[PDB]
Amino acid sequence: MRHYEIVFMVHPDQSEQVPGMIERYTAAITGAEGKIHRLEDWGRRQLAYPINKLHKAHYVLMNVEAPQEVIDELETTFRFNDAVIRSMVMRTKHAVTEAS
Amino acid sequence: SLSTEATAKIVSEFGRDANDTGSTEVQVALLTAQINHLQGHFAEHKKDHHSRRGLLRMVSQRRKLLDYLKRKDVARYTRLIERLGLRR
């Protein structure tokens, strides 16, 4: 398995889902023998540009270590979940931890 | 290029002993790998010409490698072919 620094921001008035989403993700990841080396939460932070209105979103970090197979099953879930908006995900670059 | 595991692994299998990658027979097999595998990557996309270069290059190298073996030891040559199901 490789590392993947994923940071997905969710709709503001959807914060209640933030915990549910996170808990669900981590589950699948760990299930496939994945390793979580970090997990931030920038919370309801101000947005630079009005990304599709609502200049306020809810960010979160991951930087896990799951097989490309699973993250893929996830890369799509984000697209099929109105609740979440812009989603990014970088590669390994050596398991990042804490800080940020 | 090649999987570290599968790489070293495939080496011990043909190496004149152990930790002798430079070994002739070894090169062939080790090369045939990415060769027989790229087939898939190339079967798809197909227009990945630039990548073809690497293939064609390493491909010709196998020949230039086998010919040598057959020239400095007809034995090993005729053997390797078998275990790799080469020569048509």
């Binding site: 940071v7 921001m9 947005l47 630079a48 540009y49 009005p50 990304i51 979103a57 960010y59 812009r86 990014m88 940020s100 | -």
Partner: protein
């Protein structure tokens, strides 16, 4: 100096128009400028930085 999260450091290599500052005006290494400049981009795509002074 090389991370979109570090929205602080980046604000140093970004004028008012949001555009990044040339490697000369900063006198920084080109090698660093590249990995650095790219951070501003990826950061701009997470609303962590302004594309321009307007939107």
């Amino acid at each position: 100096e090389i991370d979109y999260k570090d929205i602080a450091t980046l604000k140093n290599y970004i004028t008012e128009s949001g555009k990044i500052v040339p490697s000369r005006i900063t006198g920084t290494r080109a090698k660093y400028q590249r990995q650095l400049a790219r951070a501003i981009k990826r950061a701009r795509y997470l609303s962590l930085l302004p594309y321009t002074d307007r939107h």
